[model samples]
Target: AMACWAQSQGYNCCNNPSSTKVEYTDASGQWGVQNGQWCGIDYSYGQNQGNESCTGNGSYPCCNTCQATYTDGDGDWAFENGNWCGIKNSCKQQPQNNNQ
Candidate 1:
C-alpha cells in the first residue's frame, strides 16, 4: 500500500508497507534525510530528531502535511518548540498538555 501510494505521488518507499512506521527512501532506494521520502512527513529524514534543521524549506511542507494527517487521524501529539528533525514542531501548534 505504501509503495503504491508513494509511487503514485512520484516518490519512492521501502517495502513492508504494513510497518507501524513506514519509511520511504530516495530514488536510489536509500534512506537519507535530505534525500529521503516525503510521506505527509519526511520519513526518510531523521524523524522527530534529524540532522537537518526544521527551518529548511522542505521541512515545513513535510511537517505540515504530516501534522494534517495526524490531525485527521485523531492523533494528538504534544509538540514542543524544538527542531524535530524534518518534522518541526514550531510549524505546528498543539494543545498544551505536557512536554514531550
Candidate 2:
C-alpha cells in the first residue's frame, strides 16, 4: 500500500484525518490548515477511488453555470453542496437577452 508523498516528507495528508476546508492551493496541490499547521492534500488518494461523477469524485466536475464563486490554481471554482467545485473551461459569459 502506497502512502501519501507528504507523509514521506514529514507532513501529514490533509484528508488523512479529513479536512474538507481548502485553505490554499499551489503547483504541489490543494492545502488545508490542520492543528494550526499546513498539510498537503492527497489528490491521488482521492482520484484512485471510484468516480463520483459531478459530485462524488475526488475531483469535482466543472460547473454548469458560468458564475465564478472563487478562484484557485486550477482556475475558477463554484460553491455547491457546501463544497468547492471547479468551474468548466467551456463555461463562458453570455450576452443578456434584450427583448422589448
Candidate 3:
C-alpha cells in the first residue's frame, strides 16, 4: 500500500518476486532513489537470505528488485524505510517493442 501510494505520487518504483526498488521524493524532501536499481543476491541475512530470480529478480532498480534480504545503510528493505532513498533518477520507461 505504502509503496503503491508512493509510486502514484509521481515517484519511481518497481519490484517483482525477489527483487524490488522504489525511487521517490521522501518526506524529508530528498530525491530518494533517483533511478532506483535492485539486483544481485547475498545470503548474509540468514538461512533464507539468498537470491530470488523467480519473477525477473536480480535486475535493475526500477526494472526488478533485490531479494538478498540484506540491510543497506538504512537497516531496512530500502534506505531507512524509504525515508531517504539512495537512488538518483526515476524515469518511467515504456520499453521499445520495435526490433528495428
Candidate 4:
C-alpha cells in the first residue's frame, strides 16, 4: 500500500520482501536506502548476511530493483512482489505470446 501510494505520488518504489521499512525513492533527493530496509538516507548497510540475492532481509537497506542485473542474458522478466524484475540467469524464452 505504501509503495502504491508512492507510485501515486509520482515516486517509484519497490516492495522488498525482506525489508524492515519502506525503503524507496528516486535521485531527485538524497533519497537513499537504509540497511536495505527503506530508501531515505545513509547506505550504511551492505549485502545480505546469509542470503543469495540482495533483498532487504535482516538488518540491511532495500536495494534498488532496477540496479539488479541478470547475467545469463535471456531477457526474461517477472513481477517480483511489487517491482517489475528480470530473471536473465535461468529458464527459457517467451515464444509467441509473452506471459510470465
**Best candidate according to lDDT:** 2
lDDT of 1 by residue, 34-92 (tens): 23444433333222222222322332323333342233221222233443323343334
Which runs of model 3 end up more than 4 angstroms from their true locations? 1-3, 21-25, 28-100
Judging by lDDT, tell me the better candidate of 1 and 3. Answer: 1
- Ordered by lDDT, highest first, the candidates read 2, 4, 1, 3
lDDT against the true structure, each candidate: 0.33, 0.50, 0.28, 0.34
Q: How would you encode candidate 3's per-residue C-alpha lDDT over 1-100 as one tens digit per residue?
A: 0232333445433333133332434453323232244221221111121232222123323222332234343223333343332221111122312332
The order by descending TM-score is: 2, 4, 1, 3
Q: Model 4, 1-100: lDDT tens per residue?
A: 1332334445434333233343344554334344443343221122222222343233433333433443222133444566555432112222412332
What TM-score would every model get versus the actual structure?
Answer: 0.19, 0.34, 0.18, 0.21
Worst 10 residues of 3 by lDDT: 40-49
Candidate 4 Cα errors over 4 Å, as ranges: 1-3, 17-98
Count of backbone collisions within predicted model 4: 12
Model 2: per-residue lDDT, tens digit, 1-100? Answer: 1345566667766554233466777776667776677667653333222221122225664455556777664445777656667544334323322321
Off by over 4 Å in 2: 16-19, 43-100
